[PDB]
Write an enzyme that holds these catalytic residues in place. Structure first.
Site, mmCIF file in Angstrom:
data_model
loop_
_atom_site.group_PDB
_atom_site.id
_atom_site.type_symbol
_atom_site.label_atom_id
_atom_site.label_comp_id
_atom_site.label_asym_id
_atom_site.label_seq_id
_atom_site.Cartn_x
_atom_site.Cartn_y
_atom_site.Cartn_z
ATOM 1 N N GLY A 16 41.894 47.938 39.674
ATOM 2 C CA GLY A 16 41.153 48.450 38.513
ATOM 3 C C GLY A 16 39.686 48.647 38.833
ATOM 4 O O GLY A 16 39.229 48.194 39.908
ATOM 5 N N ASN A 17 38.957 49.302 37.927
ATOM 6 C CA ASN A 17 37.506 49.573 38.075
ATOM 7 C C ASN A 17 37.266 50.163 39.477
ATOM 8 O O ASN A 17 36.410 49.633 40.226
ATOM 9 C CB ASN A 17 36.685 48.312 37.786
ATOM 10 C CG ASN A 17 35.187 48.540 37.821
ATOM 11 O OD1 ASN A 17 34.720 49.679 37.813
ATOM 12 N ND2 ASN A 17 34.432 47.463 37.922
ATOM 13 N N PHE A 18 38.015 51.206 39.836
ATOM 14 C CA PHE A 18 37.825 51.929 41.116
ATOM 15 C C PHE A 18 37.943 50.927 42.269
ATOM 16 O O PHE A 18 37.230 51.093 43.278
ATOM 17 C CB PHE A 18 36.453 52.613 41.143
ATOM 18 C CG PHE A 18 36.233 53.614 40.036
ATOM 19 C CD1 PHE A 18 35.745 53.209 38.802
ATOM 20 C CD2 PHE A 18 36.558 54.956 40.210
ATOM 21 C CE1 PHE A 18 35.579 54.122 37.768
ATOM 22 C CE2 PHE A 18 36.392 55.865 39.175
ATOM 23 C CZ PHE A 18 35.892 55.449 37.960
ATOM 24 N N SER A 20 40.506 47.411 44.183
ATOM 25 C CA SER A 20 41.761 46.644 44.334
ATOM 26 C C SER A 20 41.470 45.379 45.142
ATOM 27 O O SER A 20 40.608 45.426 46.040
ATOM 28 C CB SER A 20 42.826 47.497 44.997
ATOM 29 O OG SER A 20 42.468 47.791 46.351
ATOM 30 N N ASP A 130 31.759 42.081 31.702
ATOM 31 C CA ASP A 130 33.243 42.200 31.795
ATOM 32 C C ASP A 130 33.892 40.826 31.614
ATOM 33 O O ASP A 130 34.904 40.542 32.275
ATOM 34 C CB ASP A 130 33.647 42.884 33.104
ATOM 35 C CG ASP A 130 34.986 43.593 33.009
ATOM 36 O OD1 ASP A 130 35.552 43.643 31.880
ATOM 37 O OD2 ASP A 130 35.474 44.037 34.078
HETATM 38 C C1 LIG Z 1 39.313 37.652 43.959
HETATM 39 C C2 LIG Z 1 40.678 37.010 43.898
HETATM 40 C C3 LIG Z 1 40.938 35.879 44.636
HETATM 41 N N1 LIG Z 1 42.127 35.266 44.612
HETATM 42 C C4 LIG Z 1 43.081 35.840 43.859
HETATM 43 N N2 LIG Z 1 44.299 35.226 43.823
HETATM 44 C C5 LIG Z 1 45.463 35.644 43.175
HETATM 45 C C6 LIG Z 1 45.648 36.750 42.351
HETATM 46 N N3 LIG Z 1 46.900 36.843 41.922
HETATM 47 N N4 LIG Z 1 47.538 35.762 42.467
HETATM 48 C C7 LIG Z 1 48.954 35.571 42.184
HETATM 49 C C8 LIG Z 1 46.706 35.032 43.248
HETATM 50 N N5 LIG Z 1 42.922 36.969 43.157
HETATM 51 C C9 LIG Z 1 41.715 37.560 43.147
HETATM 52 C C10 LIG Z 1 41.562 38.748 42.327
HETATM 53 C C11 LIG Z 1 42.538 39.712 42.009
HETATM 54 N N6 LIG Z 1 42.089 40.651 41.189
HETATM 55 N N7 LIG Z 1 40.787 40.318 40.951
HETATM 56 C C12 LIG Z 1 39.953 41.117 40.076
HETATM 57 C C13 LIG Z 1 39.932 40.533 38.670
HETATM 58 C C14 LIG Z 1 39.543 39.120 38.670
HETATM 59 N N8 LIG Z 1 39.234 38.015 38.635
HETATM 60 C C15 LIG Z 1 40.423 42.562 40.053
HETATM 61 C C16 LIG Z 1 40.352 43.281 41.409
HETATM 62 C C17 LIG Z 1 40.418 44.754 41.044
HETATM 63 C C18 LIG Z 1 39.488 44.817 39.814
HETATM 64 C C19 LIG Z 1 39.605 43.470 39.107
HETATM 65 C C20 LIG Z 1 40.446 39.167 41.589
#
Ligand SMILES: Cc1cnc(Nc2cnn(C)c2)nc1-c1cnn([C@H](CC#N)C2CCCC2)c1
Ligand SMILES: Cc1cnc(Nc2cnn(C)c2)nc1-c1cnn([C@H](CC#N)C2CCCC2)c1
EC number: 2.7.10.2
Lengths: 281, 280
Positions: A16-18, A20, A130
């Site tokens: 999301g938000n350009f 991943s 956000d």
């Molecule tokens: C930075 C991070 C570190 N560890 C994990 N671990 C994880 C995720 N799912 N599971 C099962 C385990 N995830 C993230 C993670 C995924 N998405 N994000 C953003 C939103 C938030 N907070 C998104 C990225 C695209 C825009 C917003 C952080």
């Protein structure tokens, strides 16, 4: 810092938000035993988006706090931000899946850690823009962190607000964000109220901010943002979640004050939440 | 494309703008027979300088033209830009060393190739910002190229100027560069007039732009401040001894205070080519 050839894709964590985030193993010794990490990358890259991403990286590099995802480094428009991997994922999905094992005391522990993360952000004059359960991550049953800073902005040296766009989470937005695009600590406070509503509605879809606001707006020839601005001007507010304690709902209603300067501080919110939790325990 | 283990240092070719160019051999077969090349690197590395250098590399990658040094590749922040090696070095030092063998016709050949390189730059909406004989390189007695793009900027899609700033070659700068930091094709044209003055003064130190402007300035205030007042009052570099009238006329039009009255590089190319043809 980190080499692309050693970055081993494992699975998709968020998009999301350009952008991943991908779960990757950094295995510079090729044994399959390296450390799992989070890798954020740009989607539909533009010089404009790349400049924002560089600022995002610098924002997270300046942040060291127990309730903020940890900056690890960068990998060299193919620029990739490397962070720690939080195994339990987004609080939104975690709460939705584990709600039966999470009582009000745990919700206050989550709320308390978000406030302390936001208070820290305050000290650097950063506005998240956000703040939502979908941008909060679970490290362990006892620790949450703010996990994304894709819309985060540094206040100018001479102003207490930043004026900013694209598709935006209008059901978390402060009246003055909707009407004049003005973003401030007080706008983050308003969004923290919606986060408290999310937690105490246990992410129930029937009760989500978009669900409740849409029912209040009605089913014209006008925009939803237009209707929402009128509903907020007329003191239209999210309802009290079923079983939400009065002190918690009182905190929500104060966060959702039309007047920026009547909204509580994250320091006041921290203290209030910690004491209510202490009372319940 | 290029590995550091095979990059063999030979000699220092140039240093400046937080950067250095080195003559290296790429010898992956370890025989001392590989291709000699130019390697540009950062000195006082700052993420911002690294970001500027990354854009510089991408700018030169998009450029293919007879009068622009050839992008060869990159070597991995220790990020190094690899270019072709032009063996006769900077026109400034080449002219200074070979002036007795270089007549006005040859100066026009050099001037013509610079204009064509600058016109090409025009077509990509790039502004050099550092047009000077020190950034021109000699390949052979018949070919010159623009060799550095350390200050080059892409114009925004909606504007004909870029507003920018550390140590700067103020004696090559357009009035609107000095006062408002505005850079444009017309600012590169103003600098091209100074390059024409350099060539026709045969890089004589007594006649250099900084020499002449300093004599004209003569305080209380900054040199930049005096220079802005001198240019506003129509203080201009003098006519080089022996400079043909058409060449000096071209300089004086390049140094018009009004951005929009300065000639185009296409017009300058044509004018220079014909004057050379008339001189035979
Ligand atoms: C930075 C991070 C570190 N560890 C994990 N671990 C994880 C995720 N799912 N599971 C099962 C385990 N995830 C993230 C993670 C995924 N998405 N994000 C953003 C939103 C938030 N907070 C998104 C990225 C695209 C825009 C917003 C952080
Ligand atoms: C890119 C390049 C390719 N070949 C050669 N050949 C050469 C030089 N000397 N000799 C005897 C032979 N030189 C350069 C070279 C050196 N310096 N530059 C920049 C200025 C310009 N143009 C400097 C780099 C740092 C600041 C500006 C280009």
């Amino acid at each position: 810092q980190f080499e692309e050839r050693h970055l081993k894709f494992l699975q998709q964590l968020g998009k999301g938000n350009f952008g991943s985030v991908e779960m990757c193993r950094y295995d510079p010794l090729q044994d399959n035993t390296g450390e799992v990490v989070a890798v954020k990358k740009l989607q539909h890259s533009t010089e404009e988006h790349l400049r924002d991403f560089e600022r995002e990286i610098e924002i997270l590099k300046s942040l060291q706090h127990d309730n903020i995802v940890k900056y690890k480094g960068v990998c060299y428009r193919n620029l990739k931000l490397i962070m720690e991997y939080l195994p339990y994922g987004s609080l939104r999905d975690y709460l939705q899946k584990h709600k039966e094992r999470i009582d009000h005391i745990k919700l206050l522990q989550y709320t308390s850690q978000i406030c302390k993360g936001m208070e820290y952000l305050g000290t650097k004059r950063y506005i998240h823009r956000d703040l939502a359960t979908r941008n909060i991550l679970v490290e362990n049953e006892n620790r949450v962190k703010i996990g994304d800073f894709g819309l985060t902005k540094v206040l100018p040296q001479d102003k207490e607000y930043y004026k900013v766009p694209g598709e935006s989470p209008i059901f978390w937005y402060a009246p003055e964000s909707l009407t004049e695009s003005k973003f401030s600590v007080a706008s983050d406070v308003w969004s923290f109220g919606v986060v408290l509503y999310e937690l105490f509605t246990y992410i129930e879809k029937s009760k989500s901010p978009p669900a409740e606001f849409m029912r209040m707006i009605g089913n014209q020839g006008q925009s939803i943002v237009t209707h929402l601005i009128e509903l907020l001007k007329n003191n239209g507010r999210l309802p009290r979640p079923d079983g939400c304690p009065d002190e918690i709902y009182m905190i929500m209603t104060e966060c959702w004050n039309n007047n920026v300067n009547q909204r509580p501080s994250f320091r006041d919110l921290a203290l209030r939440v910690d004491q209510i939790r202490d009372q319940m325990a």
